[PDB]
Amino acid sequence: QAAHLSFARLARRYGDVFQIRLGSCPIVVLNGERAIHQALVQQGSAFADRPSFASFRVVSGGRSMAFGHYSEHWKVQRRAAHSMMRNFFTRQPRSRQVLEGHVLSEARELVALLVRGSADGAFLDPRPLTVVAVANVMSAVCFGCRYSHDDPEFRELLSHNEEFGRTVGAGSLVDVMPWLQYFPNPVRTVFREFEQLNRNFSNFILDKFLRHCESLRPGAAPRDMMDAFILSAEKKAAGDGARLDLENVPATITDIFGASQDTLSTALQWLLLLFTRYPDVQTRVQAELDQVVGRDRLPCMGDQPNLPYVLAFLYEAMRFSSFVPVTIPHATTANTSVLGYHIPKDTVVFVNQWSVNHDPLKWPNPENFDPARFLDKDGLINKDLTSRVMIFSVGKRRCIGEELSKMQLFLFISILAHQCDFRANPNEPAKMNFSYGLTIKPKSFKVNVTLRESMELLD
Ligand code: HEM
Ligand SMILES: O=c1cc(-c2ccccc2)oc2c1ccc1ccccc12
């Protein structure tokens, strides 16, 4: 009875567009591509707002770009945030390399713990490990500092991503049923933890913020995204496009660091999950990797176009898993209509991406994981299908770190699959259970990892 599941089901009787009621709020769910594309794209702007939920307000000390409203001040915050994400990567020559180094560097520490903690036929839950590996890629990209996988204070800071999606996830009752805060219950519990975690994240980034600001003297060369945003803001305040104001820099680096670390973490956990539940797909991608990059070195972004199956497994896991089933709730900015239906200004809207990835007609093997589903008659991928998958949303509020997400999940998996073997715990009868909320996170599950060959990952 997962949200995105009921909605897609209610659509088989009331159409793609219809409205539900969560407590006091009547939400209008969008389910198909034409409806999703007609609201978010064609009438994008009418649907580019965020609902006035008290919890959204708590994120990033009240200055979130992801959870804030549509307005001019917001408009430059996003433009400025998207600018950093586009330029930051591919800004200077050899930049791609420094990025790939971080991934390569976390991939090494990641396989090492997985293999070490999997000796003699042992199994271990990969999740905690995958969060730390992805947060470090971004800890270094954003602050220029990575943490020890043993670091408690950091593993703690990142041990609450589930409480975050349960609070803001479409379906959540925290906002729409405030009376639930009046007494003990899971909803009272999650929201209080929610405030607790956002409070910790902000302080974590605030501390780093104040230090980068202090060390960034006149002629100083920025060596971060923190340093990059601060410089830009000082250059903005200091006389004379879209750049952030110093007061908004901590909040926006929080959204940036927070999203990636959560989403990329969740995504990664599915890849290994799928690898262990589909040994054959694991072998094929693991085969193509051997044929193209050779057992002679480890994969790099240069190999991406000669790896049609890897990219295919990538988009199949994306469509099949739909780990971000419904986008961050939207809100209309003006009375509008979609697929005929009237939608009055200031109404909360849910975009069902899962309903576009699981549409029978567009995807024949709807419930079956078929990476070949994206392979062209002669073995190459066809953007026409690969780009038919919806996970990063579309429109004004579409993800700002899409290419980064991709040129990273490709790498983590390329190294891991090329260097390791993943086996599921056979003794586990009942199946994998998940936690629904913004992202679909896998609940506890154990894998066993062994090295195909000697570590050349060691530098
Ligand atoms: C595979 C990983 C990721 C997926 C599937 C994903 C997807 C999404 C989705 C579904 C949204 C909501 C769109 C909407 O409400 O209409 C979004 C928001 C956003 N994403 Fe991502 N994301 C991921 C990675 C990233 C990364 C790496 C960053 C960090 C740079 C990031 C930052 C953002 C931001 C700042 C927003 C809010 C944008 C806005 O409100 O306008 N995401 N993403
Ligand atoms: O701004 C955020 C966006 C996002 C986000 C997540 C998924 C998709 C889009 C945005 O999440 C977070 C954010 C901030 C802090 C978080 C702390 C824990 C877990 C997630 C956080």
CATH of the domain at 126: 1.10.630.10
Among positive and negative, which fits the CA dihedral 428, 431, 432, 433?
negative
Tokens 């991934």 sit on residue: 103
Q: Measured in angstroms, how far is the CA atom of residue 73 from the centroid of ligand 1?
A: 19
Q: Which of 136-152 are b and which e, b meaning 16 or more Cβ less than 10 Å from the residue's Cβ?
A: bbbbbbbbeebbebeee
Choose which residue among 158, 198, 255, 441 to substitute to test ligand 2 binding: the one with the highest number of ligand atoms within 8 A of its C-beta. Answer: 255
Tokens 């780093």 sit on residue: 208
Q: Decide: 258 in ligand 2 pocket, CB within 6 A.
A: yes
Q: Residue 240 is which amino acid? A: D
Resolution of this entry, Å = 2.7
Beta bridge partners of 28: 19, 349
- For residue 89, the 8-state DSSP code is T
- Alpha-carbon span 60 to 198, nearest angstrom: 7
Choose which residue among 127, 164, 194, 197 to substitute to test ligand 2 binding: the one with the highest number of ligand atoms within 8 A of its C-beta. Answer: 164
Q: Binding site annotation covers 142?
A: no
Backbone breaks in the chain after residues (C–N over 2.5 Å) = 240
Q: Which method was it determined by?
A: X-ray
Q: How far is CA 334 from CA 8, 46, 72, 76, 347, in A?
A: 26, 6, 16, 21, 9
Q: Decide: 164 in ligand 2 pocket, CB within 6 A.
A: yes
Q: Decide: 263 in ligand 2 pocket, CB within 6 A.
A: yes
Choose which residue among 88, 263, 264, 403 to substitute to test ligand 1 binding: the one with the highest number of ligand atoms within 8 A of its C-beta. Answer: 263
Burial of 168 (0-12, 13-18, 19+ CB in 10 A): buried
Helices 186-215 and 161-168, axial angle in degrees (round to 10): 110
Q: CB-side exposure of 269: number of CA atoms within 13 Å?
A: 28
Range of the domain at 146: 1-459
Domain count, the chain: 1
Among positive and negative, which fits the CA dihedral 331, 334, 337, 342?
positive
- Alpha-carbon span 415 to 448, nearest angstrom: 17
**Helix H or strand E encompassing 34:** helix 33-37
